[PDB]
Amino acid sequence: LPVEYLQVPSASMGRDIKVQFQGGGPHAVYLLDGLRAQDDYNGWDINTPAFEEYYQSGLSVIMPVGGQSSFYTDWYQPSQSNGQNYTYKWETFLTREMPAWLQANKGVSPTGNAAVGLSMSGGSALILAAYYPQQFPYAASLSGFLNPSEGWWPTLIGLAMNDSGGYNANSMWGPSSDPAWKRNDPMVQIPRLVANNTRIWVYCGNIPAKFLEGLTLRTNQTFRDTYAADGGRNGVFNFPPNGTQSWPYWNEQLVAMKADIQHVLNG
């Protein structure tokens, strides 16, 4: 497999970002990592046969490396906690710096791509499509936080970020009253997804665990209902009863959506 590891400078973060890359077409699937993203390899490559599965698909595969608890967003400030000495600017990196580099050096198109995220980055993928539709006509959220600004979620997200490397949600989007929470909330941005005619693929499977499961189920159902209510007509919603929040099932969804991505991005 022709897999490469690239060092892509980020001016906005003042450091080089490692990117795992497999070519195979001008359009690409951006495979975003989960909450506990490591600095050596992307979780998709650690845990799944994603590169092999998309080999000769007619699509390039891009796996950025790093950004633990970042939500692939532009933060307000360095993390209030764990000694981070720069500000995460992952939205700038994914929408400007990285595609600029891949276009200039390899001819990867900056437009007409897919964003696929899981856990932490499921919502990120939808937000990228909401605000950058020419770049991401396709977005998939696998077990993402679909309503991060609502109810229990700002607290639960803050707790998860702190548990995953000691990152501080206040440094990211401010207190939960800050406009950044709603800005980055896929539920709140459903009208953009509808206006953009984004092709969305939304998966989810199924404090005490049962309480968390109830919150998750209700939020996911609300997202689906709201998408339809708001005139959404370009979505796939996969809620299989046996679905889990795990790399094996996230891989199953990545494989299942391959034909979908091929038809949307490559006709």
From Swiss-Prot:
Give this protein's Gene Ontology molecular function annotations: acyltransferase activity, transferring groups other than amino-acyl groups; diacylglycerol O-acyltransferase activity; trehalose O-mycolyltransferase activity; zymogen binding
Q: Which UniProt keywords apply?
A: Acyltransferase, Secreted, Signal, Transferase
Ranges where the record places region Fibronectin-binding: 51-61
**Keyword check for Cell division:** no
Q: Which residues cross the membrane?
A: none
Q: Which residues bind substrate?
A: 35-36, 119, 147, 215-218, 222, 245-247
Top-level enzyme category: transferase
Report activity regulation: Inhibited by 6-azido-6-deoxy-alpha,alpha-trehalose (ADT).
Its annotated compartments are:
Secreted
Q: EC annotation?
A: 2.3.1.122, 2.3.1.20
Impact reported for residue 119 to A: Do not form alpha,alpha-trehalose dimycolate (TDM, cord factor) and alpha,alpha-trehalose monomycolate (TMM)
Give the record's GO biological process terms.
glycolipid biosynthetic process; lipid transport; mycolate cell wall layer assembly; response to antibiotic
Q: What else is known?
A: Was identified as a high-confidence drug target.
Q: What does this protein do?
A: The antigen 85 proteins (FbpA, FbpB, FbpC) are responsible for the high affinity of mycobacteria to fibronectin, a large adhesive glycoprotein, which facilitates the attachment of M.tuberculosis to murine alveolar macrophages (AMs). They also help to maintain the integrity of the cell wall by catalyzing the transfer of mycolic acids to cell wall arabinogalactan and through the synthesis of alpha,alpha-trehalose dimycolate (TDM, cord factor).
Tell me the subunit arrangement.
Answer: Homodimer.
Q: What is this protein called?
A: Diacylglycerol acyltransferase/mycolyltransferase Ag85C
Which part of the complete sequence is present?
A: 52 to 328 of 340
